[PDB]
Amino acid sequence: EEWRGEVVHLSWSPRAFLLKNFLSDEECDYIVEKARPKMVKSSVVDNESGKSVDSEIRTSTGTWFAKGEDSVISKIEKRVAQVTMIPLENHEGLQVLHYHDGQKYEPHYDYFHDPVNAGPEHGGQRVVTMLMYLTTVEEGGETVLPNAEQKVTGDGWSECAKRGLAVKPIKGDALMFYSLKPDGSNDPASLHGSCPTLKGDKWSATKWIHVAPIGG
């Protein structure tokens, strides 16, 4: 339910907020261990040939959990609803990803479902995304926002990260960022990616949250 913790304001363009210690270590491990045997390489069906091929855009492995999948996930899902102030009926289920060994997600918008996403196709417009880091990544793996106002600088950031505002994955933290402005218009500043993971293993769980109930 209701969560009490440190929020770091990252940006107004796009609106981005870092929720410190949003998940416990135990919850992070639970999701990773539940997801692990289910992970498959990110793939899309190539239109021309009509064949399944590895995505060149999201090169992680991936899976999904249904909203309300089980009790432990359900609890987190209610917490996500509380901090975003948007009811559960508008939330997709968890998208779990694992990147390592150079794997990335090229910058894109979360405005709509993408064929690369594991799980069902949900029509509808996302307003907000929550990205929950399930592991701490030693090198690379930053979530980068290239159209943000203030780029990150200095040693300790991957070259990819220095192309925008960037967030280092730290176990238990969650990045909340808005794809739409408060008036429902698109925010082009919400372009975001996952910089290649260079050392370690990046596990993340994404919650995509719509302006209106999913389906139903």
* Nearest CA among 191, 84, 89, 87 for reference residue 132: 84
Is 164 among the residues that bind ligand PD2 (CB under 6 A)? no
Is 143 among the residues that bind ligand PD2 (CB under 6 A)? yes
201 interacts with, out of ligand PD2, Zn ion, none, CB within 5 to 8 A per kind: Zn ion
176 interacts with, out of Zn ion, ligand PD2, none, CB within 5 to 8 A per kind: none
Whether omega for the bond prior to residue 216 falls within 30 degrees of 0, making it cis, is yes
Pairwise CA distance, residues 55 & 6, whole Å:
36
Length of the chain: 216
From the list 78-86, 89-97, 103-111, 118-126, the region that binds Zn ion by CB under 5 A is 103-111
Q: Which residues contact 189 (CB under 8 A, 6 or more apart)?
A: 11, 13, 14, 145, 147, 148, 149
From the list 1-9, 34-42, 150-158, 189-197, the region that binds ligand PD2 by CB under 6 A is 189-197
Is 201 among the residues that bind Zn ion (CB under 5 A)? yes
Residue 41 in 3-state DSSP? strand
Residue 85 C-beta: closest distance to Zn ion, Å: 21
From the list 10-18, 150-158, 176-184, 186-194, the region that binds ligand PD2 by CB under 6 A is 186-194
